[PDB]
């Protein structure tokens, strides 16, 4: 798609059974437990046309997804079926679709309806992808949440950094900065490896985060996730429960053994890496629950209570 985004949006949130109107002061912010309709108004080679985005978070609940069901069939209608559908996951929105704020990232807060009170010890993963779309997604504000690869965002309401890891980009720079714009908070540039006490005194106290080399280094062969060869950005529901997932990071593919998976799957998984490699290296495996620092770094936004 090549219209630039700039169209006139309007933004429901899916409470119960209805979508309700969200704040066109804060189109761009969403409630990761929280699915989302957009609909998207653009002219484009002398033709206008709508879009209808159907956004759903990844906590967001079985119930949330099948009432937007509905609600879209019922939006699609009052405009005479006309629009062009699509429904989106958290984290596998088209260029297009993030092209909707002006620049500005998507950002994601943890949490939600059933609206929660946002705890002011809040931690910020900022991640952009290879054309720049960038997304600011809400960690549990622990201290081994951290990545070199990334910006990240803290915040207590006292102090405010925005720690930039050595592996960040401008992009991600940029969107941190947006995020405490947003946020209403100022900003201390911290680098890594430069932290104040302050700041693993908030985090509840230094731990040695999600830390590797090839995480650390600088230029950038991308993370490329297959199970047993994932589009998009890389999550944690990304990892299917019952299977065997490959994470080669290029300089070291891992082995995600997913709990209920059977026992050949891991004994093929293994075969493949071994062929995947050597028709051009550590296969280090790990288990679904027991995930190494350097493992879950990958990940946009990982919950350690997840499962």
Same mark, same amino acid.
């Given at each position: 798609?090549?219209?630039?985004?700039?169209?006139?949006?309007?933004?429901?949130?899916?409470?119960?059974?209805?979508?309700?109107?969200?704040?066109?002061?804060?189109?761009?912010?969403?409630?990761?437990?929280?699915?989302?309709?957009?609909?998207?108004?653009?002219?484009?080679?002398?033709?206008?046309?709508?879009?209808?985005?159907?956004?759903?978070?990844?906590?967001?609940?079985?119930?949330?997804?099948?009432?937007?069901?509905?609600?879209?069939?019922?939006?699609?209608?009052?405009?005479?079926?006309?629009?062009?559908?699509?429904?989106?996951?958290?984290?596998?929105?088209?260029?297009?679709?993030?092209?909707?704020?002006?620049?500005?990232?998507?950002?994601?807060?943890?949490?939600?309806?059933?609206?929660?009170?946002?705890?002011?010890?809040?931690?910020?993963?900022?991640?952009?992808?290879?054309?720049?779309?960038?997304?600011?997604?809400?960690?549990?504000? +622990?201290?081994?949440?951290?990545?070199?690869?990334?910006?990240?965002?803290?915040?207590?309401?006292?102090?405010?950094?925005?720690?930039?890891?050595?592996?960040?980009?401008?992009?991600?720079?940029?969107?941190?900065?947006?995020?405490?714009?947003?946020?209403?908070?100022?900003?201390?540039?911290?680098?890594?490896?430069?932290?104040?006490?302050?700041?693993?005194?908030?985090?509840?106290?230094?731990?040695?985060?999600?830390?590797?080399?090839?995480? +650390?280094?600088? +230029?950038?062969?991308?993370?490329?996730?297959?199970?047993?060869?994932?589009?998009?950005?890389?999550?944690?529901?990304?990892?299917?429960?019952?299977?065997?997932?490959?994470?080669?990071?290029?300089?070291?593919?891992?082995?995600?053994?997913?709990?209920?998976?059977?026992?050949?799957?891991?004994?093929?998984?293994?075969?493949?890496? +071994?062929?995947?490699?050597?028709?051009?290296?550590?296969?280090?495996?790990?288990?679904?629950?027991?995930?190494?620092?350097?493992?879950?770094?990958?990940?946009?936004?990982?919950?350690?209570?997840?499962?």
């Amino acid at each position: 798609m090549d219209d630039d985004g700039t169209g006139q949006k309007q933004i429901w949130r899916i409470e119960g059974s209805n979508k309700v109107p969200v704040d066109p002061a804060t189109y761009g912010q969403f409630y990761g437990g929280d699915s989302y309709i957009i609909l998207y108004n653009y002219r484009h080679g002398g033709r206008q046309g709508q879009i209808i985005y159907n956004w759903q978070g990844a906590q967001s609940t079985q119930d949330e997804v099948a009432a937007s069901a509905i609600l879209t069939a019922q939006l699609d209608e009052e405009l005479g079926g006309t629009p062009v559908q699509s429904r989106v996951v958290q984290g596998k929105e088209p260029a297009h679709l993030m092209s909707l704020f002006g620049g500005k990232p998507m950002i994601i807060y943890k949490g939600g309806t059933s609206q929660t009170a946002p705890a002011s010890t809040r931690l910020f993963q900022v991640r952009a992808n290879s054309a720049g779309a960038t997304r600011a997604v809400e960690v549990l504000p +622990k201290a081994g949440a951290l990545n070199s690869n990334d910006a990240f965002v803290l915040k207590t309401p006292s102090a405010a950094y925005l720690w930039v890891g050595t592996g960040a980009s401008e992009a991600e720079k940029t969107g941190a900065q947006e995020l405490l714009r947003v946020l209403r908070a100022q900003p201390v540039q911290v680098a890594e490896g430069s932290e104040p006490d302050g700041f693993w005194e908030a985090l509840g106290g230094k731990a040695a985060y999600r830390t590797s080399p090839r995480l +650390k280094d600088k +230029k950038m062969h991308p993370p490329r996730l297959f199970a047993c060869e994932v589009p998009g950005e890389l999550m944690q529901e990304d990892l299917a429960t019952d299977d065997v997932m490959l994470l080669d990071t290029w300089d070291q593919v891992f082995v995600w053994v997913g709990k209920d998976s059977q026992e050949e799957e891991k004994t093929e998984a293994l075969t493949s890496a +071994k062929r995947y490699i050597e028709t051009d290296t550590p296969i280090t495996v790990v288990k679904q629950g027991f995930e190494p620092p350097s493992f879950v770094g990958w990940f946009l936004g990982w919950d350690d209570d997840y499962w």
